[PDB]
Each structure stands twice: as C-alpha cells, then as structure tokens.
Amino acid sequence: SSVYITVELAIAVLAILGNVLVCWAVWLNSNLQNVTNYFVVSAAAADILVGVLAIPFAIAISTGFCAACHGCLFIACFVLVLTASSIFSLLAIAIDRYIAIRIPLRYNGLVTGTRAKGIIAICWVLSFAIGLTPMLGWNNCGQPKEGKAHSQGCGEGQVACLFEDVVPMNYMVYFNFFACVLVPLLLMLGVYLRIFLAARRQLKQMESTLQKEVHAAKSLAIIVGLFALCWLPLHIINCFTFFCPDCSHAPLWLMYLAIVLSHTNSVVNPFIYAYRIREFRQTFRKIIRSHVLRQQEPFKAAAAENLYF
C-alpha cells in the first residue's frame, strides 16, 4: 500500500533531518561538547541509521517479495537490531540524567568520556545479541509457506518475504517485547519518578536545583510518554496475535499504523529532548537560519532587481 509506503518515507526523512541537525549542533557549538551529550549523539546516530537503513528495509518486508527465507530473515533481524540500538542509546540518556540528579557531585568523576563510550558499546552489544537471536535458529525458516510463495509466483527455494513469516511471534512477545520495550520503559519510568520525587521534596521545603529538576522531569516525561505511545501499540497487537491464534488477524491498516508509529520514535527521540536545551536550540536556529539566508537568495536578488527597475 503506497499510502503506507509514503507516510513511512516521510518519517525516514524527518528522522534523518532532525538527528543530523542534532549531530551537526554538537560539532559547531563548543559548549555542547561534554560527556552528557555523547549519549545524545549516540541516540541521534542510531535514529539516523533507523531512517537511512531500518525504515527502507521495513518497507521491503511489507511487499512480500520473492527471496530466500534466510535472506528475508537477515533483513528483518537488521531492522530489529537498529530499532533496538535506538531504544538503548535513548535509555543511556535517561540513566545519565538519573546519575546527574541523584549523585551530581561525583557525576563529573564517574561519568567520564571514556566510560561514556563504554556505555555506548554496551548499547550496541545488547542490540546485536537481541536482534540477531533469530539468526541462530529461532526463526520460522524451517516451515516455509509455499501456498503463499506460489501466489506471488516465487521460484523454487523462495518464499514471500514477510516479517510475520520469518520472525517468530514468541521471540517477539517473550524476548523482543520484554528486552527492548517493557524493561527500558520501566527503567526510564523509574528514573522519571525519582526526578519527580526530588522536585516534590524541594517543593515541600519551600513551604517552611529545583528549576533544573522540574525541567528534567518534563524532559523525561516527554521521552517516556512518546516512547510508550510509539512502541506499545505494535507490541500489544503482537501479543494479541500471539495469544489469539484463532482470532481473525488484526487489520492491515492497523498493522501499517502501528509499524509507522513505532518508527516515529526516531524523529521525536531524542530530538525533542535536545530541542529543550537552549544551547542546542540557539545553535539549531543558526543552522536553519543560514539555510534560509542562502537558499532563498536567488529569489531575494530576483525580487530586488525586478522592483529596482
């Protein structure tokens, strides 16, 4: 459905633009170049890779093209890996802020530029292990669907490349959902509640740092709210599919909606978090400004000459 394909393509661009913007901003503005923002670039880097590589792959998987089963699984696993990297690098940001709020003194001596790269490594180790788990054998390739491969006119040794055809639902529900979504969601939620409670005790004291903690809280509330909005629907649908095999499958428009919605996490996270730091936002203006005072210049001079005469 080109209707789904086009919407999916918008998000890729939007994710690439916003996150290149984020990465650009850290190169130019010298104040932005601290340990705290490593975790932001990492997360922004992943979302670029999601826009550049994962969303294209996700589009192919929806058509049901003819290829080798084990070829089809590699594409799906690659999507699973890069989306996972997006989530974990985002979680790193949340864990950083947690240290920065709860133990802000030794933070500068604990969260160092070296250790920061250690944490980014872990994000990528965990992503490959999880998304490549189906490659090891936990995949539906032992049971190819030839009744469907025929309808698509696929040659012998070829199946219709669908996600739900190569990637097992139990892997999705039992391993992927818990490892990639529910845990990081609970941890981030836990972090937010620990930053919220920190503000409430500061607010109870004013009755007898606070400005930082209120802002951080709303920043965290945005990350988590959007994360749950983006990721849960698709996973809940997955659970429905897995726990109701006799049900008629959830509608393909809803499938398309949920898949798209999952991908839209990469445009908002961690973009909006960064947009909520002034030092970033000023730098963000310097870039989009320079894009207007130079890309509208051909028409600016053309108007200037037309009136001149």
Query: Which bin fits 253, alpha (ψ -120 to 50), beta or left (φ > 0)?
Result: alpha
- Kindly determine how many residues on this chain lie close enough to bind ligand ADN according to the rule CB under 6 A: 12
The answer to whether the annotation marks 238 as part of a ligand binding site is yes
Q: Which residue is listed with tokens 């002034």?
A: 278
Min CB(144)–ligand ADN separation in Å: 18
The yes or no reply on residue 168 touching ligand ADN (CB under 6 A) is: no
Longest dimension (CA), the chain: 79
Helices (H), 50-172: 55-60, 69-102, 107-110, 113-131, 146-151, 163-166, 169-170
Q: What, of ligand ADN, ligand SOG, none, does residue 97 touch, CB below 5 to 8 Å by kind?
A: none
Strands (E), 151-224: 159-160
The answer to whether the annotation marks 62 as part of a ligand binding site is no
Tokens read off for 124: 């990528």
* Identity of the residue, 112 or 170, whose beta carbon is nearer to ligand SOG in the bound complex: 170
Which of 100, 263, 267, 277 contacts ligand ADN by CB under 6 A?
263
Closest CA to 23 of 283, 301, 290: 283
Q: Confirm if 54 and 78 have CB atoms less than 8 A apart.
A: yes
The yes or no reply on residue 253 touching ligand SOG (CB under 6 A) is: no
The yes or no reply on residue 234 touching ligand ADN (CB under 6 A) is: yes
CA-to-CA distance for 53 and 83, rounded, in angstroms?
A: 10
The answer to whether the annotation marks 263 as part of a ligand binding site is yes
The yes or no reply on residue 259 touching ligand ADN (CB under 6 A) is: yes
Q: Confirm if 262 and 50 have CB atoms less than 8 A apart.
A: no
Residues 126-155 that bind ligand SOG (CB under 6 A): 133, 136-138, 140, 142-143
- Contacts to ligand SOG by CB under 6 A: 133, 136-138, 140, 142-143, 168, 170, 174
Q: Which residues are annotated as a binding site for adenosine?
A: 164, 238, 262-263
- Contacts to ligand ADN by CB under 6 A: 58, 79-80, 83, 163-164, 172, 234, 238, 259, 262-263
